Design an enzyme around this catalytic site. Sequence first.
Site, short mmCIF file in Angstrom:
data_model
loop_
_atom_site.label_atom_id
_atom_site.label_comp_id
_atom_site.label_asym_id
_atom_site.label_seq_id
_atom_site.Cartn_x
_atom_site.Cartn_y
_atom_site.Cartn_z
N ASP C 8 58.29 -33.40 -28.59
CA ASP C 8 58.51 -33.19 -30.03
C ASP C 8 59.79 -32.38 -30.25
O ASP C 8 60.14 -31.50 -29.47
CB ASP C 8 57.30 -32.48 -30.68
N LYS C 68 67.86 -31.30 -37.16
CA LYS C 68 66.85 -32.12 -37.81
C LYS C 68 67.38 -32.74 -39.12
O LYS C 68 67.08 -33.91 -39.42
CB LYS C 68 65.60 -31.26 -38.09
CG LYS C 68 64.80 -31.65 -39.33
CD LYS C 68 63.98 -30.48 -39.89
CE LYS C 68 64.84 -29.31 -40.36
NZ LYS C 68 64.06 -28.32 -41.14
N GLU C 145 54.67 -36.22 -36.65
CA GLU C 145 54.10 -34.91 -36.37
C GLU C 145 52.64 -34.83 -36.81
O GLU C 145 51.76 -34.54 -35.98
CB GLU C 145 54.89 -33.82 -37.09
CG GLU C 145 56.27 -33.51 -36.51
CD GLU C 145 56.89 -32.26 -37.14
OE1 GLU C 145 56.25 -31.66 -38.05
OE2 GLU C 145 58.01 -31.86 -36.73
N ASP C 167 51.68 -28.26 -41.87
CA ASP C 167 52.78 -28.03 -40.93
C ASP C 167 53.37 -26.67 -41.30
O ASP C 167 53.64 -26.40 -42.47
CB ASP C 167 53.85 -29.15 -40.99
CG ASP C 167 55.07 -28.91 -40.03
OD1 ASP C 167 55.31 -27.75 -39.60
OD2 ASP C 167 55.80 -29.88 -39.73
#
Lengths: 85, 130, 502, 51, 51, 51, 50
Positions: C8, C68, C145, C167
């Site tokens: 990840d 990201k 995710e 999250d």
Amino acid sequence: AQSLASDLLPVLDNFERALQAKSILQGMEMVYRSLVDALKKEGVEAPFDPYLHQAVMPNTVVEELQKGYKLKDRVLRPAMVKVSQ
Amino acid sequence: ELAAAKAQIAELEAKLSEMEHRYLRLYADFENFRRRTRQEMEAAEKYRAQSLASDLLPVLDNFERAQAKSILQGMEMVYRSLVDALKKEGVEAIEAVGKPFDPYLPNTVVEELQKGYKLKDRVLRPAMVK
Amino acid sequence: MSKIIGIDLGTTNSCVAVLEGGEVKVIPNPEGNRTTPSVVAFKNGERLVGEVAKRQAITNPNTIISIKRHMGTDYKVEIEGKQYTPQEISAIILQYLKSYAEDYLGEPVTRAVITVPAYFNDAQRQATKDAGRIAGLEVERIINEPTAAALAYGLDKEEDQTILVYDLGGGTFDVSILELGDGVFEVKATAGDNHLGGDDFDQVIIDYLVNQFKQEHGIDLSKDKMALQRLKDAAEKAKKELSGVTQTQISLPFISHLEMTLTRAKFEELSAHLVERTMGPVRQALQDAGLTPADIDKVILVGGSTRIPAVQEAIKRELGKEPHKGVNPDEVVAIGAAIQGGVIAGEVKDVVLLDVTPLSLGIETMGGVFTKLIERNTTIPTSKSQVFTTAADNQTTVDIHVLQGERPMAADNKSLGRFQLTGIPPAPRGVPQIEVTFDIDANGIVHVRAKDLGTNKEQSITIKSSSGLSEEEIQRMIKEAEENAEADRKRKEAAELRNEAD
Amino acid sequence: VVLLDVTPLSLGIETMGGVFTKLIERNTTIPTSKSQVFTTAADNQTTVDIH
Amino acid sequence: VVLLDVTPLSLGIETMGGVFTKLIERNTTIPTSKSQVFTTAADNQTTVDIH
Amino acid sequence: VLQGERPMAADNKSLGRFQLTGIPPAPRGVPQIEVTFDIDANGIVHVRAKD
Amino acid sequence: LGTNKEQSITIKSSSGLSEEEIQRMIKEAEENAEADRKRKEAAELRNEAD
């Protein structure tokens, strides 16, 4: 064992940066000195590369902000330094 | 050939049982490793900083023993996080304080000269005691 | 073959994990770090990556920080000697993650799988499989995710349902509402905050702290960065304490020194404001889907800073029930990536039953003194073997008597087997070897063998029930060994080594 | 019945040619000893490993 | 030291087709005992000879 | 090693003596020890004692 | 033998696993016993041609 040598390096660098009442700081021959050799009999030694001088903010490292020690070929808690950019 | 088809069919079903077994004995051995290992590393890390500790019993002998009043207030986080960093590990001092006072560890403990160092079901260095 | 390895990348949250056997595993990095993070650099002829790249970052031209934001974008960095793209930089993120998963396992992972956002679509979530294979490690699929940690845990035993994730990034927040397709995951709703999180929490600590110190001595704090580092760390501490613990303090002293008794409800009224910057993202989801807070089958806690009771005291009184905490949320994406990683290329349907042994099994020494070979709790499909020798010179034969329990005594234990064995050759005691393999199958009838060596004459037994009985009856005895707490007085027969006459 | 100990697994040295050759068969006993010989690998060896 | 009866030679039977099998190997000991198992010298052998 | 006809050590010729060590400690009569005498055509005789 | 050179080790019985690991890797020897194939290297006596 390096575990007492990382989590104890805050108090150790705390006394390490502190080196009539004038003569009571001489009693520091022992407490923040002795821990050096008594923490150097397990094998603890204190180019900068790879986070090695932890940079608050040429090519060489400047001085030591809050220092740190390798456990002898290990790393537990890092060390503060400043670079001449 | 004809029912040798069925023959190998057999062979393979057989290696089904045979196989699954070959496995579950595996699951056995695998999962089994844990009890052991867990306890092995237990005993690994109870001791072995004993050298760090009874070596460190002199420098916390003067950080438990030894204008500048602000400079003496500073020793706060020093001997705060150095009997504190003896903690998550577990090497304590000797706490009886005016009792029977086990002599390897009338007749009551009056005072104590050397501060205790002990990590997890053992004795490191004794105190010279009143 | 090869096991399919999770990686990840969460932009300051990142991990590469795996599965060995029947237990899900979170790898260690080259740094002492349980997880080393996402950002990097370069220099002349030699790359520097990770927690080792990142503090050469405020000291050297090259640092990339949370890229990201540029995955699936036309973003191009101008950097020394060639400009660079998100893909080639991430190729090195996972080149380093490759050498590191390699220097952990030794059994290489070529095949690997990724953890992306649930919001992403054909552009960027392709960028994942692509840059996933840029470093050289192929992608057998790309999870998201949220559906990821959902299946780290996993939902597919259960029924058609609904959910919302939590999250918590590194200073980012998110939640994604999901549903069950009776075997299918399709993420329904999405919400959160671009900057909110743990570091911010640390800075409310550092802020009220510094402000309070200017409140006493008049002397300001933030001008000083070993002091402020001291702050970040100690305040992080007090934080996670406030989470677990009921009371606190902070020893920050020899400052220049602040020694305070760190409070929880002051830190809470400190932090109970941004907990409604969340309820916004949350209920915005509740409308993106349309179904009220009362429409869901299960819901969860994710991220690094999610370990404090702040959000959970905002929820227990929000959606009606408690979260599934059955994880170690910090790394919870990584393992998730590989769950199906090994549901695809690997193992299939799993009982994993009769994984335990009723009791410690051993046999009749020295007139009943009971020695163990098998312990309790032991995975059943197994057998252990041991060889005794002669009671006394010239034993012409040997009887075998086996016990089950703990208490080291004969009728202080359950008589299991009694059967004997004869023809042994005559000769000095202790010498001749007789073996007993306790042979324990999976299914519960236990075989047990004893056979001389020099003979190769052998008698074994096939028992029947081993139990025949219930749980309470056993555990009442498992209790009983404890209850006796030194019937060990039979060290009395331990000094019956008087048996030795010489 | 009783204890002693069987050396539960048979020990040996890599022999030359790269094979395993037992010097102590599996279930043996309380401490014992074995001794055996072996010789030069190829012409004029100066040195010999033992694994 | 004292001497113990050894089986100065080692005994056994012929095994089919045909060969000497060792049963009680040579320098063995004072009384001892040993045993083994083999099967029919043929397809449903009529009878079994032990030499 | 003794040479004579006489049933007691004392009464014979003591030709030579030597010892052997290392045998595994373990019960009496259990360990084997093999001494062989060998005489050549000269009248010279070697003795070997081997566990 | 003739030069009397004594260099030697001692094992600490540490690394070798006897919990399961033995009662495993023997049955290994049973499953796999056709491992007698070994003789290959026996045949590899080949390079003994000097």
